[model samples]
Target: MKVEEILEKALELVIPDEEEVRKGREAEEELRRRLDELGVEYVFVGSYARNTWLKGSLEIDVFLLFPEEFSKEELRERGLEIGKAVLDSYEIRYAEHPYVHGVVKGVEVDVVPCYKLKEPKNIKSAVDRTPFHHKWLEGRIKGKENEVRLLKGFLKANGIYGAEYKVRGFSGYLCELLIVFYGSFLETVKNARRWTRRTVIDVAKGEVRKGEEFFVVDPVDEKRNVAANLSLDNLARFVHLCREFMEAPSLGFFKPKHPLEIEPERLRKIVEERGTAVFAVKFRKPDIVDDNLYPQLERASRKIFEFLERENFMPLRSAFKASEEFCYLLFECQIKEISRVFRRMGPQFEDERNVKKFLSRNRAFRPFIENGRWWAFEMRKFTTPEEGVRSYASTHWHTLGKNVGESIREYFEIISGEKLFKEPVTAELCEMMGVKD
Candidate 1:
């Protein structure tokens, strides 16, 4: 099919009509009856719990809540019997997707079993060792049901269509997981692009590409290798929050127009208005969050410097340690560094008014000093004594490190009518940090 046709068809499957819902209800009712006959308790999760954001996808996640006293093998045997019986009676698609380790329905329906808990909300671990932070995320997105549904649709359509070739797209469920922490799906998108980089042999077509070809193991690319490193607790915490706020706990899937239900036009507008400024100002802060915010970062930084330190840059690990006592001080220094380079970006992309307005919107988050709040665009570096100043003016080469550094210094210095760094970090720092983008 043509791309547009695929998109249109995909959109249709994503948002199911009444007939589709009827089919799911028939299957669900029969399955529930079977479980009842077996005297087992169950709770519905997945697409039914959240609004259906995929077109043709109708996942009926029936969590077979068995007693804790039962052994894992016993519960698995019971779940398999129940699942096999249901599939045997109905035409619904089903299988045990390895990640969740249960029969998945069709191309979309996912079914996993969980042990019943007294709080239900407190049930963290699934049948597998996976920690599903269902309650934590539920609390976060308690009132934004529509937003999460929208994100799920968007992710499904644009994300991984199949587990083919190098096609490792993040799932709609993963997108839902991210939305809880990001407030809006757009915020999460802003920070999604860059992550840890690893060098591995590409064994495609039984041919290995050595150092010649390096592929970034992005989380969005849901390849098996990448999936192994991700944290289930962190992923589940976000997904749980998206479902907690729904008015109807038992609503069945209502297919959206698209698989990944997000409207790209809406997301585009947000980026067009704030893209440059957002990237411009992002460097003005230190990454301190140990969990979702900066997973494997410190270790990655270590690997980077160990291989390429002498080429041009230095490690500022010590500075990061020192700045722990005064986070504001670190932010101020980094802001000065970033503003310096951003000013040189000129009229083509960087608009002074937009930057000021963008910063104003976020200024509430700034650290205060004495009776006044400090400058909003702040930066910091992790330093080692051998590394002199650990801070860099840019994270990517396109940023023009020295220029951004100049802008940062100029913005702060002019306020007091004084200049800070006579010069900024150069290609030297970029190489030191081994920045590519």
Candidate 2:
């Protein structure tokens, strides 16, 4: 297929139709009417306000801007109150500040509380600068909404389309900015095909920071990076996919196939074929927001992987995932079990006192000199990685990661072999084991 065909199909799938646009605008108007009744000061922002929202995924971001004189607590309290009054019902959510999330006539809405600022530089919090961004894009983003939608659909199909911590990928605003910078969806993809680590697209031509990854200077706020949340892996995948699509345009790039469902028997067969041990630390999901929970899960996964390496188990790779009910920290090990006896290299022979101290401590290991180094063959504490992980979870759970340790201490289990086949996490496990995408 040609680029035009690809974009045409993608735009059809992603862009909001006239009715959708009307419904979304009506929801925004209703909220504004209610806020006006309550004498609340706010402005519509985000994708909905800028008219770049995708079909079936519209979220109205209404910023309740407060005066600088108000206390932070007052801002949240009054903002939430106004939000509750505007919407039928709402729940308080947290990020930099507390925001109200609710539904208005079946449409999702976020009533964010932010400090009113005349300029982006004097912003008090992260959301404070969004209104300015909405205004900037509104003026410059004319005749390009469809191009922006195409870029978003392609990213979403490829699983690189969110600014959340868990995804660490492109944002809707980032997509719009790219379309604005490159003039069209295909042009954006072409530019991305040649993007290097140091590639910079400074719309504001602002002062660049050192050691920064690819930069897209925020036109509204030059001090901030629009692409800061984008992960290196996500960026690399986008670059490769763009190149591949240009060579041979396919509908699959615009709409990827569904993820394969992993079966227990299939997973077991793959495990046998690979001849490697796969283990997981399963625990009850935390009752918190994803933004806060994912970071803790990542820290815990790394700590366990490092612990396994320290204990002489060669960990090939590690990953983690979470559902509404549970969280899993996964690891693939080169070997589940190791020799009962392993060598521990101590101080070199030149450091006689330190060597003597080491020898005195491990006399049972029978220290010996080899190649001008002190070595001792010590008995392994736990022969298998699974055993080590279980024991560590039971006894040293506090040593995992600060937040994760506390969470794991409440409840956790170590599972391996066919045990994981029965769990609902089979799909993620298979992906972690390189069985499915």
Candidate 3:
């Protein structure tokens, strides 16, 4: 299909139906009635409030505007009490601060506590700038909501649609900014293909700003980079996706992918055929929420990946995933078990003084000068990947995560083959191996 035809079909799927819009409005009405009755000032924000919500979206953000005089503690406590008094089926969730999450008229709602600012620059906290963003985009984003949806839909299909740590993809506000800058969804896609690392969309001032990887400067807060959370790899994916999408347009580009379901035996067989050592560190899952948890997971995964490289394991892939009961880190490398002795290089053999010191501390074999520099064979502390992982864990447990570090410290095991295959992570492992693609 042509690009226009594909987008037209996408809009049909992305756009919310009458019933959903009606329910959303009804929830807003109920929210306003309750908020106004209690004399609690509020402003609806986020995708739902801006009316760029997709057909599947149910989350609504309503900022509880508190007075500037209120201290952080006072505001948080009051905000909690007000939210507790208002919403049905509420639970506290963490963002910049703890906020109330609950249901209102069959829709999920977030009652975020924020301070009312005199102007956008006087922002006390992150959420405080939201009102300014809503205000700035109000009239401008009116007819362009559908374009925002198309951008978001395209991103979501490619598995990068949230600014949340897990996805590290584009946010709805970022989508709005892109559409506003490029005028339409198709134009945005066309421009995004050529977006350089320093591409800055300054919607407010019509000026350019230097930024790291794909930056969309906040219209409300010039100092802030709205797309700061977007990962470089994801930005690369989006750029490549736009290029491919333009060359061959299709509705499949907007359709979300289903999990690649496979049986345990099939996963084991796949691992076997790959002729690589697949290892896992299964540990007790900490109770930290996903936003904090995911970044920690990525950090730990990278550290371990770099560890494998340093150890000469020649790792091909590294990934992390969490389940309700456990946290898992997986790796695929060329060798699981390596030779006991590896070459260790020292100062030049001609340097007798240093050679004497090298001779004092030595090898599995006599020190040799085959590679020009003084060389010696040093016995490895651990020959197997499992043993190396155990050693790394023991030495660097503290560096993993705050809560997760402690959890891993208490319990973790290096696993492979039947041990990992028995667990329920076939799809995730497939994704990690690039098998799903």
Candidate 4:
């Protein structure tokens, strides 16, 4: 594993403390007021209630609990109402993808709508499971609270906390579960051991690692690509963290500029090249998949597409230099879903379709997905985050090198026991819609 992975894995296990808990509760209170003010029923559903976070590093997962009288649309309308209220007072502007969006008290809070549920294996239950897993993790770590506290401070003082880099600012509960997933922070302690003297602030601004930068294999005009300016501070922090863990980092980097704002033509090449690279990597040994691999790929791709559709994102919207801005919803949601599904499947055949079916039924999942989409969408147009984030564009990285299409071809091949693709299908399929990636 890479040092970034170590940092991520360690972060998963760090529980929140009193201060974090207070922030979470305050966030919850704000959400509750919005819901009540809008006349919709909502409640906390994840680790906040489950006790998986640090007391001070709390992240409140709340739902606008639907009263029986309201339909989903009605509930959504109410959500919009509250969201507007939130936007009016909050310093942050709101993005209207599905669920409404706005920053609350400088905290990036996501508000979702959830119905009550009973099964732990179901989508609702899976979310509930986060807290349980967190509690389980806390049982293993001795100074769990301290670890999270320091990390949170690191995120807060540095430009990482509310920023869009995927690794930092994970909900307290999610962080705790990551600890369990990686076996323990102890596993990463060796890397941590090296940077024992470094402060969290230094790390956030990219202050520590000792390795040659990975080659940017894709054809990139370094002068035109803002990514060329990737903060050394960020890299340094990961390096330090990696030294602490004695492992290589997987994937961890911030988007220096909005993808949509990049030259559309050049962005196309970047997506194709990078997406192919990603596909080649994932397909290398197929560690990301299990026996029932076909279903996992389908589920992952479909989920990504569905999320994009829900958020009204075209691949072009996310490219460099477009009317839209830098939204990372599709990227973030894809990673989260892919990770969870992979973990559930293990190395054996897993009926991902079934799991997905189970998840799709949960009312809460819909809102969470929508709210996430909104957050990412808003980030695109807003200057506070990445400048020139967008709402429109063409093309898609998801179909890069026709990986998605190939996945489809493979699915049919699995059943027919015959080769299906002579050429990539994802790009061709998009051609019917006048889009390319």
Residue-pair clash count for candidate 1: 62
* Every model: Cα RMSD to truth: 21.9, 2.5, 2.0, 22.9
Model 1, TM vs. native: 0.35
Worst 10 residues of 4 by lDDT: 319-328
Local accuracy of candidate 1 as per-residue lDDT tens digits, 1-437: 33323334433434568777677777677667766887777666655555534545566666676676776666666766666665533232323322132233332333455566554343335332122334334445566554555455544433332222222344444445556545654445333432222222221221223332223222222232423333333334333433431322211222322322223343334434432111111122233332321222233233333422442233232111112221111111211112111111112124557545544554224432322222343332333221222233223212222332333333311111011111122222222323234
Give the lowest summed-lDDT range of ten residues in model 1.
Answer: 413-422
Q: In candidate 3, which residue pairs clash?
A: none
Candidate 3 residue spans exceeding 4 A from truth: 207-212, 362-364
* C-alpha lDDT of all candidate models, in order: 0.37, 0.83, 0.85, 0.36
User: Which 10 successive residues of model 2 have the least lDDT summed?
Assistant: 203-212
**TM-scores vs. true structure, each candidate:** 0.35, 0.92, 0.94, 0.32
The most accurate candidate by TM-score is 3
Whole-model lDDT, model 4: 0.36
Question: In candidate 4, how many Å is residue 320 off?
Answer: 11
- lDDT (10s digit) by residue, model 2, range 143-218: 8988888888889889899989888899988898888888888998987898877777876552333344788888
Report the lDDT tens digits of candidate 3 across residue range 253-284: 98877875878887888888888889888898
